[PDB]
């Protein structure tokens, strides 16, 4: 079992800049037994370099791998935003195949502020009983952000899910969701549903809120 | 241009057997040049090679260690396939479960994990499947930013994961997002997919979300109409 470790974990470059990926392997390997592979999301990982130093067929020359016995290098000479991916190293010992648990590459990018949008619920939830409001942060950058709900100026807990999306391919940003349930009983009993939202693109906190 | 079709999204009882089919495109499974794998995916086993099965004057098969007495891979000449059987399954093997072909690509010897199935999310739980329900999130004034405003549906209550989302039959795909599940505290999924569209639209053209939870085999249009 030779175990393959990366390094970094995380790593977050701007476009343009060179990507220095490593793969450290727990004993020697042959060079012949290491590859790479990229994994975008939603798809099954893609074969990248093998062999160490060869590009499989149709990676573009600014990818190339390096490396032998312990240490193996993937170097990404110059980013383009598409290349936002986990990457994989992984060797064959003939019977068994292992992966490192991966790096992650964050596309760097200027700050944007979100776009805040709510939406009450649906008259159609609301007549079975459930009423869920969602707050929408879209298309911001850094990835945090905070959001909090105020229902009739009361600072709400523990009653609201955030999802965040993955960086978008179109612009490397991020989008978000808080979404607060109640019950209609619970909705019906209040006026003024507010979300405020602070991120550090924006001059001031931003609150969308809306009367029933 | 060997192309792999794995089956469906599934959900299976903790201590039951996984079973899963990959239909093979493009080439034969009982090529002497390939060697037919499995892989599975999630946050507790990293990216994890599971076993191989392969034809060389005979049927060979090669397992992992992790898993050497639980599984079996089977291929299926008749049909130009091979599956996956794990017995006894644990909530540890949830995962993306990818097939992919293995070819010789150093002189002979390495071989190398070259083409890959889409995936399929097995989930290990012993709740029962139930489709979601749909709701429209409506445009309104509160939903709008400068002359750009967003809708989106809400997709609730269902089991297990995944649901896709298209929008307009997949004729609108500029500034869609749709959101990572969430789980409820009732034990059932819910996600919302929003897109930001102009709001000099809204009167004229038509939104409709598409919901697909194959699991329940549930298809749902929702037309988004602005409330106001």
């Known amino acids: 079992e030779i175990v393959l470790t990366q390094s970094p974990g995380t790593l977050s470059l701007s476009p343009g800049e060179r990507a220095t990926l490593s793969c450290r392997a727990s004993?020697?390997?042959?060079?012949?037994?290491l590859a790479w592979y990229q994994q975008k999301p939603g798809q099954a990982p893609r074969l990248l370099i093998y062999?160490?130093?060869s590009r499989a067929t149709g990676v573009p020359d600014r990818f190339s791998g390096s490396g032998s016995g312990t240490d193996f290098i993937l170097t990404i000479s110059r980013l383009e935003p598409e290349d936002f991916a986990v990457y994989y190293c992984?060797?064959?010992?003939?019977?068994?195949?292992?992966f490192g648990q991966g790096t992650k590459l964050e596309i760097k990018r200027t700050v944007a502020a979100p776009s805040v949008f709510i939406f009450p619920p649906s008259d159609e939830q609301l007549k079975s009983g459930t009423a869920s409001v969602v707050c929408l942060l879209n298309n911001f950058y850094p990835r945090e952000a905070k959001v909090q709900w105020k229902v009739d100026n009361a600072l709400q807990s523990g009653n609201s899910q955030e999802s965040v999306t993955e960086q978008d391919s179109k612009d490397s940003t991020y989008s978000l969701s808080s979404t607060l349930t109640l019950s209609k009983a619970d909705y019906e009993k209040h006026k003024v549903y507010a979300c405020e939202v602070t991120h550090q693109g924006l001059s001031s906190p931003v609150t969308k809120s809306f009367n029933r | 241009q060997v192309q792999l079709q794995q089956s469906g999204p599934g959900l299976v009882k903790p201590s039951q057997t996984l079973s899963l089919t990959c239909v093979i495109s493009?080439?034969?499974?009982?090529?002497?040049?390939?060697?037919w794998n499995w892989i599975r995916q999630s946050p507790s086993r990293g990216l994890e090679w599971l076993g191989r099965?392969?034809?060389?004057?005979?049927?060979?098969?090669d397992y992992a260690v992790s898993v050497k007495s639980r599984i079996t891979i089977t291929p299926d000449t008749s049909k130009n396939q091979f599956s996956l059987q794990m017995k006894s399954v644990t909530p540890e093997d949830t995962a993306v479960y990818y097939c992919?072909?293995?070819?010789?690509?150093?002189?002979?010897?390495?071989?190398?994990?070259?083409?890959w199935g889409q995936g399929t999310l097995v989930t290990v739980s012993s709740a029962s499947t139930k489709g979601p329900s749909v709701f429209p999130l409506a445009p309104s004034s509160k939903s709008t930013s400068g002359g750009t405003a967003a809708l989106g549906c809400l997709v609730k209550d269902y089991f297990p994961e995944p649901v896709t989302v298209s929008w307009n039959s997949g004729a609108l795909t500029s500034g869609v997002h749709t959101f990572p599940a969430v789980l409820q505290s009732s034990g059932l999924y819910s996600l919302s997919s929003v897109v930001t569209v102009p709001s000099s639209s809204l009167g004229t053209q038509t939104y409709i979300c598409n919901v697909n939870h194959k699991p329940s085999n549930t298809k749902v249009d929702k037309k988004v109409e602005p409330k106001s």
């Open positions: 004993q020697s390997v042959a060079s012949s037994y």
């Open positions: 099965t392969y034809y060389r004057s005979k049927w060979y098969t």
């Open positions: 062999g160490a130093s």
């Open positions: 992984q060797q064959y010992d003939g019977s068994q195949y292992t």
């Open positions: 493009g080439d034969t499974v009982s090529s002497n040049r390939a060697a």
């Open positions: 992919a072909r293995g070819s010789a690509m150093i002189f002979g010897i390495v071989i190398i994990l070259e083409s």
